[PDB]
Amino acid sequence: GLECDGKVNICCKKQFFVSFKDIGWNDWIIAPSGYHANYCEGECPSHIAGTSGSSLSFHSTVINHYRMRGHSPFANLKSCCVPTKLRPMSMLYYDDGQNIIKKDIQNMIVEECGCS
Amino acid sequence: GLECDGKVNICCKKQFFVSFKDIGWNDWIIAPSGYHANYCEGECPSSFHSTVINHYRMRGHSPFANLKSCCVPTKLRPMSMLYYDDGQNIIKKDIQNMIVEECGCS
Questions:
Q1: CB–CB contact A23 B72 (8 Å)
Q2: Looking at CA atoms only, how far is residue B6 from chain A in angstroms?
Q3: DSSP-based helix, strand, coil % in chain B, nearest 5
Q4: CA 20 to 30 Å from B13, out of A33, B41, B73, B94?
Q5: Closest partner residue to A23 among B55, B67, B95, by Cβ?
């Protein structure tokens, strides 16, 4: 996907450092202390609706069929800058099961952004 | 997530069938003849990742304060497709990101 930079106002990927101390979950999360989660933000004008960087999925291609030619409700449904690919991250934490757990938690890190 | 009925106002999956004959794609796509593509619709009012973003938005934090949460696909499934290629060979291939399987708030 696109990453933000000087003069990029459309949907793009930016950094976002998560501190577990800062949000008060350092009591249950042992490791890591904080990590690069990233995030997505910016305008989704119609000429990039549904895209994920320089790819357009098959699903997004069907939706754009309807949107390009103004069918309802697809002509109206807004397009939003959102993660389209995320990665898991190993975490060590206290869980209710009563104990300390290590496991890959899915969907922790934004790898690619796209327009819904 | 949820599946839309006509009652729940929160983000849910809307069932939506597409015929390839209908939209003119059946000259390239041999099989299947259509499928349930589905889509997302519904409010995202007041994912680990989305979770942490939500935390900061709820504080007055000038990064995420104005960042709107949207109803978007959170899982998509592949489907087996048979189609002609740019050399008119019949190709059988799993195509990814064909079906919206679940919807969530961003």
A1: no
A2: 15
A3: 15, 45, 40
A4: B94
A5: B55
